[model samples]
Target chain A: SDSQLLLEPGDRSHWCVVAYWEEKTRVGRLYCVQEPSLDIFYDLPQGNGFCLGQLNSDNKSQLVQKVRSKIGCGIQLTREVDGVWVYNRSSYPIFIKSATLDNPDSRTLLVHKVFPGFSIKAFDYEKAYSLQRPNDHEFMQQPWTGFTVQISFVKGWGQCYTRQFISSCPCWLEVIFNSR
Target chain B: SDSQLLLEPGDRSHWCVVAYWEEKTRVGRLYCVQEPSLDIFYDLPQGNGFCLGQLNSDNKSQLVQKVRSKIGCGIQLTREVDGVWVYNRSSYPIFIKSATLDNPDSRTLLVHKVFPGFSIKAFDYEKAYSLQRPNDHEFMQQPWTGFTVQISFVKGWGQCYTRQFISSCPCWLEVIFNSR
Candidate 1:
């Protein structure tokens, strides 16, 4: 059932974080998106972000309810001169954590209390992540897991959405952000 | 005589600033080198930093002598957890100016006064030079000039170097720093 939570290709309705991978590529591509998004699949194991299991009216499990309630949580994503700007519209502070495919030292904390109406550079990935394998023909071959970014509202590493690089795409994510 | 001032291949030994260029690339491949330095020469006009004539005793012009005197002006280059770091070892403050091949609006002032013993990221070249021709298949095509960084001691522009990205050789420059 966890597989159902993964973002899929052609599924362009709900806002979703994605993890993309292509073995010989650069740092793992990670980003969030909605409609008119890049072609990505939800089938891969471990690479893709976790999706909340399907919402059930009759069999309302705690996990299902949590996922359903979060769908209504308001957040907006926009682009600015600096980076992918993320604004929290919800009442509570959102906790954010990110990690790249190459460095697995553990998820680095990007921000802890991203308060409402505040914004952050969701992904300002750049040349600092430019470490390539020796004599490797493919550009993004080293630490090939790619980059991953996770966002959580409930805190304590409970990720609401996860984004990962799917292909050789530079550390770019193309998801539509919404509040509704 | 100007041609003689140009930095050439196999001219390793004397500390010299160089302007490197590649036919179809974007990253401004620029830097200085002695023996066992980076390989960054393709073929270009003048986007690369100006080479100060031959490093010899026969042809001694005022500018050439000035350039030579500036060579011993120690500027240590190192790599740490961050990107390439440059430290000015000269008694006077080193003036640094950088420009990218893609965006030629004007030379940017990276450090007006990089004082002695002070260090700055030498390879922090990014977005300002990111414009590329549309539909270009060849890598390093757009912003064909790559990036160029010029170091000087004078207030306005007396360049000691003009490091440009010839083709994105990373380690070539790395090895040179370890020796010193």
Candidate 2:
């Protein structure tokens, strides 16, 4: 399942769509061996007030997946305690690297939670299904289901698959995109 | 199942456990009817910033089932964007009520939300399921499936349901407790 963040901030409204494409997806015949779970963290790079994290624990999330394209991206602080600074457990001193590109054959999406020093696997994208864009502006308008994404666990956290449903709608997340 | 919290500051260190019972469950000879797609709200009279809520989306509110309960509840503040204060939309506003002890069957479960007036509904506690104390501490360890609760609109917003999972823990919400 993919999380599409439609940020409608007055006149500065932007569409931040975060879709997951896993190897198990029949888009282009790529099979993933490891099933990983990912906690999407945002709003920490700018030293903001609090950091936001969301766990992908659902169907269609049984295997690791890659991101196709991101509309927007941002980071903030962690929300464990009330503004209390503490050491973060996940990879930090090191950074992971992944890529998302839309091309004829290499429509691959990669993500690296830990970059530089540490070792994290790569997530290759699958082209099974085309992106589903919404036609109107309504909360919980479109339901996301039966999509896949590949993920790499830089840290040894138990992973699982995720899917979308009718009841659980209107997901939130921030992303950075290349508008060039 | 409802999430437990520390209601009083003094109860922060208290190690009480939350007892979980299914509305579809039967205690002795009586069985509780499951309220499908219903959301239950609990409000603390002391204003300690705590509440309880349950959702029944199963479409069948036949018998009142006791799915889960909390022991120690507490308050939490989440900062919203634009430097504003927005309570977690999932949080519910609870109310204070009394039961007739002489009747022995006067206990009830109630709910309240953002509306001009409050709505009240009563359940026969004596006929509800009295499940044994569950062993699971982490929510992931509990057994929830095929149960439901009722939710009202006009005041209640966002999505609501009785959460459950499969025996093998295949996915999130998929294992949700739905009333038949």
Candidate 3:
């Protein structure tokens, strides 16, 4: 089980989580958040999985259209029966890993050597939230708020926090985490 | 030029400009504003325009998408070398007319009995903005604001004001004129 597997060590420097969100759609309607800033397109009908990648934009008015047009900069996220998987769609390999907030006992070193066009099951969205709802109070204040997933990207890792809100659509935030 | 023509007269009891905006886009994008409250697609590109009869709404967020997909009830807006035209794409005849701020002395009797697939050059975006820049003071205060156009739509002709912004990209507004 993913709960028992340990994070394999590799180039943990460049690979980091860009953005994360909980699947909070009202039980249906393709639980999707078409925000380019979030870099997540989760929950397909056939199977349950999210497609994550590098979404380049700061404009909120056309976030949905931008995300629709541009997706997958060589990385894809999908869900398996056991756990969530990350696939490297590009020709080269990418270092991938994941961590959960609820599971304090869960190890932080969860990296995988993902090859081209192949996927590796990493973390489960449901499982991650099962650990503990970190901002339970914050979510109560805001109905849209949910559990947080702080991913570290090694390539452009830095001490920067930027939040962007679309004109009338929901706001997607970009938060950087240095430590687990 | 459209600046010379006057707003035609008809069943003045029921017809008014529901929304109006200066055509800002060079080629032209879909100039639309879907207010489920009104249930009317203001302008159409080709020959098919949609008129509001009864719109079913599941909720607010989905309303925009639904209206967008289901535009052009019975009329269409087109352009020719002469001027902008509105065609009654539907089988039934629809009453069409227009008014402009530039043509204050122009007759308010600008109504036309548009037959099915037939068109009329009612208004021009470039021609309307050419009249003169109104609200220069208000716009200077808020650099984003621009000229306002009030169109009369029969049902409830509200004195709605629409402002178009042209700094970087194309942005139009839908303004309703209640009376007069």
Go through the candidates in order and give the C-alpha RMSD of each one to the true structure.
22.6, 20.8, 22.3
**On lDDT, who's better, 1 or 2?**
1
Each candidate's chain B TM-score?
0.40, 0.17, 0.34
> Residue A27 lDDT in model 2?
17
- Each predicted complex: what DockQ? 0.01, 0.02, 0.01
lDDT of 2 by residue, B86-179 (tens): 1222233322111211132322322223222333332222221222122322211211110112222122222231322111111101111111
Worst 10 residues of 3 chain B by lDDT: B163-172
What does candidate 1's lDDT look like per residue over B5-111, in tens digits? 43211211222233211111112222334332222212223423222222123323454345344533345544344344567655555555433222344333233
Candidate 1, residues A1-180, lDDT tens digits: the string is: 799756322211233333221111111222334332222222222112222222112323464345335433334554455444556655556555433223433332233457866866554434223433333333232121122244444332323333221121111222312112
Model 3, residue A11: distance off in Å is 42
In model 2, how large is the Cα lDDT of residue A31? 13
lDDT of 3 by residue, A12-92 (tens): 121112332111100111112212212233222242233432223323345443433333343554434554455554444
In order, candidate lDDTs are 0.33, 0.21, 0.30
Ranking by TM-score: 1, 3, 2
For B1-180, candidate 3 gives per-residue lDDT tens digits of 786655331111211122221221111111222211122343433222223323232223343443334334444443345544555444444443344423434423233355656766555544433332233432222111112232212211212213111111111223222121
Give model 3's docking category. Answer: incorrect
lDDT of 2 at A99: 29
Supply candidate 1's per-residue lDDT for A151: 47
